[PDB]
Structure formats: C-alpha cells, structure tokens
Amino acid sequence: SRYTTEFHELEKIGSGEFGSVFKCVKRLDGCIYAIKRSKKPLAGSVDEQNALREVYAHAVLGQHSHVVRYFSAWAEDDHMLIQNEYCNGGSLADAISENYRIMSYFKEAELKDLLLQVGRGLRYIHSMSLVHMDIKPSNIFISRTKVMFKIGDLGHVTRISSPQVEEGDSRFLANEVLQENYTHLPKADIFALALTVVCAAGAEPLPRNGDQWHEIRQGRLPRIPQVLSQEFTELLKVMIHPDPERRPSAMALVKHSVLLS
Ligand SMILES: CCN(CC)CCOc1ccc(Nc2ncc3cc(-c4c(Cl)cccc4Cl)c(=O)n(C)c3n2)cc1
Ligand SMILES: [Cl-]
Ligand SMILES: [Cl-]
C-alpha cells in the first residue's frame, strides 16, 4: 500500500458523500499533509470528471501561495488518493462556525485581508484562463502561525474558452451562470467571493432561492451586523452587481487601495 508505506495517518479531518480526508505525516520528510481517500469514481460519472477537472487544473496551475497545493494523486486497491497541503486552520466555514460557538468575529481589517488574499488566488487562476466555479467558505482554507487564506477543491475548475459548467452551491451562484450565460465566468468567481466575505462578516445564512435570493442578485447586499466602513461595504456591493462587467476583475481587486491599506 503506497498510502501506508509513505504516510502515517493521524486523524480524520473530513468525511462525506465520498470519501474521508485525513491528516497524515509523510515519513520521508516529516511534514503534515491532507490526504483525501475515496472509492474510485465509476468511469464516466460526475465524480470522475470532478477528479479529472482537479488533476488537470493542477497540471495547468502548478503552485501558488493562495491556492491549496496539490502534491500527488494516485489510485490503488479500487481507491483514489489525493495528497494536498495541510492547512492547520481548517476551512473558512469551520472558522465561521467556531466564531458563532465562542461569540468571536472577524474584524474589518481581517475581512479585507480575506478578500484580498482569495482575490490574489483568483487573479492567478484567471490569468491561466481557468475559473474556479465553486468559491464558498467551505472551499477556503486557512494556514496560521499570521494567517494565509488558500483556495481549495479544484473539482469544478473549467476553461474560460470551453467551459463545462458544473454549477456550485446555489447560495453563492451568480444569476447569469444559472441562466447558462458562460461568457463572463471570472465574474461568477468574484460574485461568490463577495458573498463568501459577507458570510465571514456575520450575515444571516444565505438563501438558496426565493425572494431573498433574487434580491441579492439584484445587487442588494445582505445585512452585515458589524459596522463596516462605507468604502469596504461599497466594494462588496459592486462585486455582486447584476451586470458582471461592472464587477471588478480579480486583477482590479488586488490593486484596490481599500484592501492594500
Ligand atoms: C482540527 C479538528 N476538527 C474540527 C474543525 C476536524 C476538522 O478540522 C480541520 C483541520 C484542518 C483542515 N485542513 C485542511 N487542509 C487541506 C485540505 C485539503 C482537502 C482537499 C481538497 Cl479541498 C480537495 C482534494 C483533496 C484534498 Cl486533501 C480537504 O478536503 N480538506 C478538508 C483539507 N483540510 C481541515 C479540517
Ligand atoms: Cl474502505
Ligand atoms: Cl481586467
């Protein structure tokens, strides 16, 4: 078994439809990795093409400081194993839940930092003519010890020039993608990033549909209980503009003074 030969398993850190994710130490280098272990997808299934999008996204991208690093993938014993960088801070979804548990929150400066850093990850992905298509808090990961945010799960990554769109979570989905308009996909990532920051900011749980859903896609920003400066707030609001061309590109985002300050 390559998995057991190369690695010692420390604890399960995720599970779901499939499979599990384990925190492991690699024996040769003594470093900690996250390894996703699952039953090998049925040939031709959605789960397989997700795994395919992921491997081939990595082949294009290689490494970036705001993208969760993909080291290796292999299959053995009717399982698929995917080795990633371990982010010791968990996902942004975890951190938001923990904030509610203990009644903490992200200060405005910390929210801007989140926005800027994920923006930097999108800038790189977009510059390679890819789009992520599943930005949301559970796919943003956190490395600490001083904090780095990284984009995880490239399973929905597709090409701008020949997009195959597996829709993401309807809570974070821009209206034009739902309308099967795939001509501005980088701006769907920007949209979802705005709502991701809004979630991080303490907003009520986002609607999956209904009037509240549609109101959001009209460019109306959900209520945020923290007082944010008006400049920060207006930047979030423009990121969910109904006209995607009025949303900033990631390039424009990471040069924004409100964020760099
Ligand atoms: C620490 C105790 N707890 C309570 C929250 C259990 C879960 O806590 C976590 C601690 C750290 C992480 N970090 C982490 N770091 C990297 C990955 C990478 C993948 C990943 C992805 Cl997104 C795609 C393909 C392959 C992999 Cl390994 C992953 O699924 N998870 C959960 C990942 N998780 C998480 C929870
Ligand atoms: Cl098993
Ligand atoms: Cl641009």
| Domains located in the chain, CATH noted | 1-63+69-87 (3.30.200.20), 64-68+88-261 (1.10.510.10)
Tokens 């977009």, residue?
126
Ligand 1 lined by 82 (C-beta under 6 Å)? yes
Q: How was this structure determined?
A: X-ray
Amino acid at 68: V
Ligand 1 lined by 94 (C-beta under 6 Å)? yes
Beta bridge partners of 130: 159
Instruction: Reply yes or no: is the peptide bond before residue 62 cis, omega within 30 of 0.
Output: no
Ligand 1 atom closest to Cα of residue 91: 34
- Retrieve residue 138's tokens: 């559970």
How far CA 70 is from CA of 39, 63, 73, 86, in Å, comes to: 19, 8, 8, 10
Sign of CA dihedral 197, 169, 53, 11: positive
CB 128 within 8 A of CB 60: yes
- SS3 string, the chain, reads CHHHHHEEEEEEEEECCCCEEEEEEECCCCCEEEEEEEECCCCCCHHHHHHHHHHHHHHHHCCCCCECCEEEEEEECCEEEEEEECCCCCEHHHHHHHHHHHCCCCCHHHHHHHHHHHHHHHHHHHHCCEECCCCCHHHEEEEECCEEEEECCHHHCEECCCCCCCCCCHHHCCHHHHCCCCCCHHHHHHHHHHHHHHHHCCCCCCCCCHHHHHHHHCCCCCCCCCCCCHHHHHHHHHHCCCCHHHCCCHHHHCCCHHHHC
Q: Whose CA is nearest to atom 2 of ligand 1?
A: 13
